């Protein structure tokens, strides 16, 4: 774990922006992880572009 | 806070989990509940009450 | 495909479906036009110094 | 140390003299010449005074009687 | 200590009674107290060997909803009162014991035939309820020794409490050496069933873990 | 859609002159309120303990674990009114200073909000904040008089 | 010099005398309370969720 | 739904829900958690000055 | 301090003071154009014959009550024609489903309502409004850290924001960066860009 | 014991030079995951690793500035060199000297490479200078540390010393900083079912995965020894 957010707050705020940020940031970090794994594997430049 | 929420999670069952019909005495209930064999999500876990 | 020579290294994936038609305004000319008029060498006396 | 103060309130009832009795016993113990009747456990002097009061050995009459006896013995 | 820090020196353990105790440790390293406490709890729970009662063959109806028939001791009542008795076998395997007496009603753990290897921590432990007649019956129960504890529903029978443990948990406290107060010291409060010295239990668990520490790196020592 | 049809009928009646501005407004208000109540009931049903779980009968309609539903059942923070806006329309929600606007609010945090939806909604929050700000002083003066009496 | 023994002496003094604290707004008698203070070495005093 | 599909494309749970093993006892916590790269910022007020 | 009836697209909606001076803080939107003597005219596209004309007219308050200005969320055909004839159109402050021929001018943009402060936050349609204004107040109090990375998410205006701040250095008529030192940037522009005598 | 089935580390595959995938024989459950977690804690905690202790750079003497030809700030160069990793010999407190000039790219080769010091990424970036007249020359003392420390932590130790020119920084001194303890039930067929554990270490390359694992296990055993008392 990195940063723990007290779940009890979010429904009161009625702000899904926490949830939206979580999903989108997870997506971005995962895509970057895949790109970095390709770079460590030194995948093809054209393959990474595709 | 969610302290009462935790209690309610303790004192309630989803519908009836695996081994919802477990019958015992209570001394090792902490061990089973923490590890396996029973959960709060299980209903009507028979328990010798004193 | 935006050329974006400055952004040729940094490009954010879009999520805005509506095809943008109007670009962002200068947003810096707010007081700038005011001062320019205040110091504009108007041939006729209508604003600024004139 | 003590977590809750209720036994002193029960032994007093008025809920006002209990702190006063504790402070009076503590001042005498800190100035000197007094020995705690209860076994000490490296706690505050007011804590010892409150514990002795709640035990049923220190009050506003026993302390006065002891003071009068000490004064008369001089 | 390459961040070896040190080991909690003070190991004072306060036992309120023979069945309930609490142990405190000196300063262990940050996280070290907590990690060690969790590990010891997981070991002592997930593995606590010992001897206890397993199954019985009592005379009468084999149905769970059976009749006390004047004994006033339901099948579950006697089953729970006996499954909690810590019948320990000396060095042998499972030992079966049976009892038969009059209708006094007073259920003590000294009524059955006293085997040399079979021993009970509490000779007055109740195994059933007071009867309303003067008859006799045979219990035909067996006492076995095992590692940790076993379920009885899967292993047909009443309760396999081979672990003679009742309560134990690891608390974590903080303290300073001079001023560095970020020290994780673990605290253990444990109420035990009996027949096992808590210090003896701790020593046995430590010995078992150390014998397993001889795996992989084998707790490699060095000059 | 049914509420919209009813409102269109009310508007037609108003155009024919049968329903005055006040009469047509009251009819439309009643229609919108009925629609809001029906939507609240439907969203409650879709959000009450309405879940099928495996069981002996393979149909265990019991307490679910949806975050909004579980939080409301606990009641520690928020309630079903918040879910009403998050998942469906927040109701009418129209008040610049005192009045009620023309078009109503039919949108959800799960479906976005109209540009004017928040804009009409804007005046209320600012008004309430300023109200608390100013009212602290009056409450203080009153309690001061009270203490002076005390 | 701030000796560690100074820290120990301060701890001993605190073990005898608790402290009292109050809240930001002045509303009711509930904002101020007395409890057993303990050095926290933190930047802000930490209170149990109790109060 | 596009976010869920992106999560799937990124080998991430579409809802993001994911279980965890505890850091103090390793226990697998229930309610498999949906999470992500969520931003945080700092305030002009700071601890030391206060 | 209430919602100004003729300020739908002139002032920042959620950006306003969060203290005693609330309401007194406002900001022009992304496409807020000014008027002649002392006012502001909010840009507004023309809407004529179904086709929502790209011709955008800076619109002030007085004339706005005459023409019908459509909502931003306008699904218009490739020719600009309105996909839905029954479209909620506002002419004099009461938006209602108006015929494809009942809108006189077309909107500017979806973001053409709020100020730059709101622009950074995306997915805002799923946000609580009081929380939204509180945060928009909160966003101002940040200060630069040791390491600066763009947050994982984006709203699309960050690069433009960095451009408009004017803290960086623009390559004002530049062609190639030759001798850039820790403070000494020597950049040579092409001869066409190299103005004569420069 | 009662058929303890003592495991053994095996199939130790070094995934990288600073990472490894090491397995072990099966063992009874309820402790194997716990054993892995305790090992990860101890190795992460008592992580003695060779890091950079003190620095001295000719051009940059005191705090934070820019010199002609220079690119990254004093702390920025501090991070850039910290971008490289250091492995020392048995004696720590080694002193490296990064000295170079020209116009070429910055690489880790152009540093004082001696017998007591190992450099892994000889392609570590040190902000290549842009001027031929620029000539980098910084001598830095690199030590082995076990844990993180504040930069202000060493303030009193050198009151007269560490003058303007002498540089000291904070550190983490965690040799591994990436290790996961996954317990899987496998590798037990003849006896009772037991869990086969695979350890995926990822370190800074200062210590070998096997040696560090053995050290952490020895520390854990030594700590468990106090539990007897």
Distance from CA of B28 to the nearest CA of A (A): 31
How is residue F84 written in tokens?
């009403």
Round the CA-based radius of gyration of chain J to a whole number and report it. 22
CB–CB contacts below 8 A, E to H? 6
* Size of chain C in residues: 50
Specify if F150 maps to a domain: no
Q: Are F97 and F122 in contact (CB under 8 A)?
A: no
d(CA I35, CA I18): 29
d(CA E189, CA E24): 8
Angle at I31 between CA I30 and CA I37, to 5 degrees: 120
Torsion of CA G3, G9, G13, G19, to 10 degrees: 30
- For J89-110, give the DSSP string: -SS--EEEEEEEESSSPP-TTS
Q: In what order do the strands lie in the sheet with J166-168?
A: J94-101, J135-145, J49-57, J166-168
Per CATH, domain J49-173 is 3.40.50.2300: no
Name the neighbours of F, counting chains with at least 3 Cβ pairs within 8 A.
Answer: A, B, I
Q: Is the dihedral of CA E178, E183, E189, E192 positive or negative?
A: negative
- In G1-51 the beta strands, taken as DSSP E runs, fall at 19-21, 33-35
Give the number of other CB atoms < 10 A from CB of residue C6.
11
Question: Maximum Cα–Cα distance for chain J, whole Å?
Answer: 75
d(CA F114, CA I8): 13
Report chain J residues whose CB lies below 8 A from the CB of H26: 33-34, 37
- Boundaries of CATH 2.170.120.12 in chain J? 49-173
Q: Are J182 and H21 in contact (CB under 8 A)?
A: no
- Residue bearing tokens 């730059």: I116
Resolution attained, angstroms: 7.2
d(CA I124, CA A15): 9
Which residues does H16 contact at the CB level (< 8 Å), separation at least 6? Answer: A22, A23, A26, H7, H34, H35, H36
- Residue bearing tokens 């923490």: B34
Any chain A CB within 8 A of the CB of I79? no
Torsion of CA F111, F117, F118, F119, to 10 degrees: 150
How is residue F85 written in tokens?
């806006």
φ/ψ (deg, to 5) at A17 = -55, -30
Q: Are I67 and I82 in contact (CB under 8 A)?
A: no
d(CA F83, CA A16): 12
The answer to whether the CB atoms of I184 and J68 lie below 8 A apart is yes
* Size of chain G in residues: 51
- Bridging pattern class, strands B46-47 and B23-24: parallel
Residues of H with CB under 8 A from a CB of E: 24-26
Q: CA–CA distance from E196 to each of E20, E166, H25 (Å)?
A: 12, 11, 26
Nearest CA in chain B to A6: B2
> For J1-48+174-229, which CATH superfamily applies?
RNA polymerase, RBP11-like subunit (3.30.1360.10)
H28 by DSSP, 3-state: which? strand
Alpha helices by DSSP H, D15-73: 17-31, 45-55, 62-72
The answer to whether the CB atoms of G4 and E178 lie below 8 A apart is yes
- In chain F the beta strands, taken as DSSP E runs, fall at none
Burial of C48 per CB tally in 10 Å (0-12, 13-18, 19+): middle
The answer to whether the CB atoms of I128 and A15 lie below 8 A apart is yes
d(CA G20, CA G37): 8
- Residue bearing tokens 């006799």: E136
Q: CA–CA distance from A50 to each of A25, A40, A45, C2, C13 (Å)?
A: 22, 17, 9, 18, 15
Report chain I residues whose CB lies below 8 A from the CB of J66: 182-183
Burial of J53 per CB tally in 10 Å (0-12, 13-18, 19+): buried
Name the neighbours of H, counting chains with at least 3 Cβ pairs within 8 A.
Answer: A, E, G, I, J
d(CA I35, CA C8): 38
The answer to whether the CB atoms of C22 and I31 lie below 8 A apart is yes
Nearest CA in chain E to H25: E38
Domain CATH number, residue D18 = 3.90.940.10
J139 by DSSP, 3-state: which? strand
Find, among C4, C13, C14, H40, the residue nearest to I151 by Cα: H40
Give bridge partners of residue I188 from the DSSP assignment. Answer: I176
How is residue A30 written in tokens?
């995962």
Give the number of other CB atoms < 10 A from CB of residue C14.
10
Find, among F96, F138, F101, the residue nearest to I1 by Cα: F96
- Boundaries of CATH 3.30.1360.10 in chain J? 1-48+174-229
The answer to whether the CB atoms of J130 and I180 lie below 8 A apart is yes
Residues 123-152 of J with CB under 8 A from I: 130-131
Give the number of other CB atoms < 10 A from CB of residue J120.
16
- Residue bearing tokens 């009162």: E81
I171 by DSSP, 3-state: which? coil
Q: Are J100 and J136 in contact (CB under 8 A)?
A: yes
- Boundaries of CATH 3.30.1360.10 in chain E? 2-49+163-221
Q: Are J177 and J204 in contact (CB under 8 A)?
A: yes
Contacts 24+ apart (CB under 8 A), E131-136: E131/E70, E131/E71, E131/E72, E131/E73, E131/E103, E131/E104, E131/E105, E132/E70, E132/E71, E132/E72, E132/E103, E132/E105, E133/E70, E133/E71, E133/E103, E134/E102, E134/E103, E135/E70, E135/E102, E135/E103, E136/E100, E136/E101, E136/E102, E136/E103
Distance from CA of A10 to the nearest CA of F (A): 9
- Residue bearing tokens 């879940």: F51
Burial E88-116 (b: 16+ CB within 10 A, else e): bbeeeeebbbbbeeeeeeebebebbeeee
Q: Which domain holds residue F52?
A: 1-135
Which residues does I163 contact at the CB level (< 8 Å), separation at least 6? Answer: I170
Find, among E119, E138, E118, the residue nearest to E128 by Cα: E138
G33 by DSSP, 3-state: which? strand
Please tell me the experimental approach by which this structure was elucidated.
cryo-EM
- For J41-72, give the DSSP string: HHHHHS--EEEEEEEEESS--SSS---TT--S
Round the CA-based radius of gyration of chain C to a whole number and report it. 19
Q: Are J129 and J69 in contact (CB under 8 A)?
A: yes
How is residue B20 written in tokens?
């919802």
The residue numbers preceding gaps of C to N over 2.5 A in chain J are none
How is residue H36 written in tokens?
């992500």
Burial of D15 per CB tally in 10 Å (0-12, 13-18, 19+): exposed
The answer to whether the CB atoms of A16 and F78 lie below 8 A apart is no
Architecture per CATH, domain E50-162, reads as Beta Complex (2.170)
Report chain B residues whose CB lies below 8 A from the CB of A7: 2
d(CA I33, CA I27): 12
Total domains in chain D come to 1
> For E2-49+163-221, which CATH superfamily applies?
RNA polymerase, RBP11-like subunit (3.30.1360.10)
d(CA J205, CA I187): 42
Distance from CA of H25 to the nearest CA of I (A): 32
Any chain E CB within 8 A of the CB of G41? yes
Both ends of chain B: CA-CA distance in Å? 30
I147 by DSSP, 3-state: which? coil
Report chain I residues whose CB lies below 8 A from the CB of A28: 152-153
- For I82-113, give the DSSP string: BS-SSEEEESSS--EEE-TTS--B----SSTT
- For A19-42, give the DSSP string: HHHHHHHHHHHHHHHHHHHHHHTT
How is residue G42 written in tokens?
């933190």
d(CA I134, CA I18): 7
Distance from CA of B2 to the nearest CA of A (A): 7
Domain CATH number, residue F99 = 1.10.132.30
Q: Which domain holds residue D34?
A: 1-74
């Amino acid at each position: 774990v990195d940063i723990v957010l007290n779940p009890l707050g979010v429904p009161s705020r009625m702000n899904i922006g926490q949830i939206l940020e979580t999903h989108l940031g997870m997506a971005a970090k995962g895509i970057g992880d895949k790109i970095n794994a390709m770079l460590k594997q030194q995948q093809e430049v054209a393959k990474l572009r595709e | 806070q969610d302290v009462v929420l935790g209690l309610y999670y303790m004192t309630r069952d989803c519908v009836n989990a695996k081994g919802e019909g477990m019958v015992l005495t209570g001394p090792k209930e902490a061990e089973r509940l923490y590890r396996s064999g029973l959960a709060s999500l299980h209903a009507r876990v028979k328990v010798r009450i004193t | 495909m935006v050329y974006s020579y400055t952004e040729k290294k940094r490009i954010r994936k879009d999520f805005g479906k509506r095809p943008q038609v109007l670009d962002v305004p200068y947003l810096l000319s707010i007081q700038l036009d005011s001062f320019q008029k205040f110091i504009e060498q108007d041939p006729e006396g209508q604003y600024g110094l004139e | 140390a003590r977590v809750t103060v209720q036994d002193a309130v029960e032994k007093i009832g008025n809920r006002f003299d209990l702190v006063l009795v504790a402070a009076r016993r503590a001042r005498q113990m800190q100035v000197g010449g007094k020995d705690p009747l209860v076994p000490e456990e490296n706690d505050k002097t007011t804590v010892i005074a409150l514990r002795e009061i709640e035990e049923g050995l220190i009050n506003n009459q026993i302390l006065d009687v002891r003071e009068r006896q000490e004064q008369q013995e001089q | 200590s390459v961040t070896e820090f040190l080991k909690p020196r003070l190991v004072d353990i306060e036992q309120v009674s023979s069945t309930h105790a609490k142990v405190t440790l000196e300063p262990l390293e940050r996280g070290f107290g907590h990690t060690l406490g969790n590990a010891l709890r997981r070991i002592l729970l997930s593995s606590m060997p010992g001897c206890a009662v397993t199954e019985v063959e009592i005379d009468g109806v084999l149905h769970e909803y059976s009749t006390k028939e004047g004994v006033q001791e339901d099948i579950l009542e006697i089953l729970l009162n006996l499954k909690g008795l810590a019948v320990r076998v000396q060095g042998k395997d499972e030992v079966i014991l049976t009892l038969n007496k009059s209708g006094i009603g007073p259920v003590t753990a000294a009524d059955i035939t006293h085997d040399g290897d079979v021993e009970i921590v509490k000779p007055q432990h109740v195994i059933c309820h007071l009867t309303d007649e003067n008859a006799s019956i045979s219990m035909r129960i067996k006492v076995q020794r095992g590692r940790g504890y076993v379920p009885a529903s899967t292993r047909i029978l009443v309760d396999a409490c081979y672990s003679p443990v009742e309560r134990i948990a690891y608390n974590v406290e903080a303290a300073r050496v001079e001023q560095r107060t970020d020290l994780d010291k673990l605290v253990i409060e444990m109420e035990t069933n009996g027949t096992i010295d808590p210090e003896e239990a701790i020593r046995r668990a430590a010995t078992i873990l150390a014998e397993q520490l001889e795996a992989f790196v084998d707790l490699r020592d060095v000059r | 859609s049914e509420a919209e049809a009813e409102v269109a009928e009310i508007q037609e009646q108003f155009q024919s002159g049968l329903v005055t501005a006040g009469e047509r407004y009251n009819k439309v208000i009643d229609i919108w309120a009925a629609a809001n109540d029906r939507v609240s009931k439907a969203m409650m049903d879709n959000l009450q303990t309405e879940t099928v779980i495996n069981r002996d009968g393979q149909e265990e309609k019991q307490v679910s674990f949806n975050s909004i539903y579980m939080m409301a059942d606990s009641g520690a923070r928020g309630s079903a009114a918040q879910i009403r806006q998050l998942a469906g329309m927040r109701g009418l929600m129209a008040k610049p200073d005192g009045s009620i606007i023309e078009t109503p609010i039919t949108a959800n945090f799960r479906e976005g909000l109209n540009v004017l939806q928040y804009f009409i909604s804007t005046h209320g929050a600012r008004k309430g904040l300023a109200d608390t700000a100013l009212k602290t002083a009056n409450s203080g003066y009153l309690t001061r008089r009270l203490v002076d009496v005390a | 010099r701030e000796e560690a023994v100074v820290w120990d002496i301060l701890d001993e003094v605190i073990r005898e005398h608790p402290v009292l604290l109050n809240r930001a707004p002045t509303l009711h008698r509930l904002g101020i309370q007395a409890f057993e203070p303990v050095l926290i070495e933190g930047k802000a005093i930490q209170l149990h969720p109790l109060v | 739904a596009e976010i869920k599909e992106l999560l799937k494309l990124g080998d991430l749970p579409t809802s993001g829900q994911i279980r965890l093993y505890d850091g103090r006892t390793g226990e697998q916590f229930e309610r498999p958690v949906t999470v992500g790269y969520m931003y945080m910022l700092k305030l002009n007020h700071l601890v030391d000055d206060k | 301090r209430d919602v100004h009836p003729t300020h739908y697209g002139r002032v920042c909606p959620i950006e306003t003071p969060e203290g005693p001076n609330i309401g007194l803080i406002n900001s022009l939107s992304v496409y807020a154009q000014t008027n002649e003597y002392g006012f502001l005219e909010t840009p507004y596209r023309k809407v004529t014959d179904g086709v929502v004309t790209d011709e955008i007219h800076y619109l002030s308050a007085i004339e706005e009550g005459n023409y019908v200005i459509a909502q931003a969320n306008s699904n218009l055909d490739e020719e600009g024609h309105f996909v839905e004839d029954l479209v909620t159109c506002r002419s004099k402050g009461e938006s209602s489903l108006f015929s494809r021929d009942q809108v006189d001018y077309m909107d500017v943009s979806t973001q053409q309502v709020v100020s730059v402060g709101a622009s950074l936050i995306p997915f805002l349609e799923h946000d609580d409004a009081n929380r939204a204004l509180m945060g928009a107040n909160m966003q101002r109090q940040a200060v630069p850290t040791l390491r600066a990375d763009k947050p994982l998410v984006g709203t699309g205006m960050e690069r433009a924001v960095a451009v408009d701040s004017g803290v960086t250095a623009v390559a004002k008529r530049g062609g190639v960066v030759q001798y850039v030192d820790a403070s000494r940037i020597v950049i040579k522009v092409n001869e066409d860009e190299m103005y004569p005598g420069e």
